[PDB]
Amino acid sequence: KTEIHGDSTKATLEEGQQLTLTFISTKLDVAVGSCHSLVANFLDGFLKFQTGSNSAFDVVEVEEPAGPAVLTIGLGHKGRLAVVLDYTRLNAALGSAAYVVEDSGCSSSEEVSFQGVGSGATLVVTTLGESPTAVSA
């Protein structure tokens, strides 16, 4: 379990993992290891992700959160991801977005970087049942 009260929190992921990041911000600069890129800019209203959109990333407009934001990405294959994020919106309503992409990026070895979580967010990184302590350290 890697947690940083600074601003960024990195942690290598291993097959069959689960990333539960509870942060209170409108921006999240994510860097999934080195074989994937994903920038969640809720400030403008779009989540740029490079999974399998061919050639490069794909910009998909997202709701306008309002403070708290729960991002839960469960891994369970070569690159299969399940981005299930539930957060509060400016529309005074709950926003539960989901993404299911089998062919995304890596899995076994992938140091994901989460910047913008500020000092108060927790990064729950566990391989289903076991705990991947940096799975490299």
Beta-strand relationship, 37-41 and 46-50: antiparallel
Ordered by start, the domain boundaries in the chain are 1-137
Whether the Cβ atoms of residue 17 and residue 126 lie closer than 8 Å to each other: yes
Could you tell me if residue 116 is left (phi over 0), alpha (psi between -120 and 50 degrees) or otherwise beta? left
Experimental technique used to determine this entry: NMR
Rg (CA), the chain: 14
Q: 1-137: CATH homologous superfamily? A: Toxoplasma gondii micronemal protein 1 TgMIC1 (2.60.120.710)
**Closest CA relative to residue 97, chosen from 132, 46, 58, 44:** 46
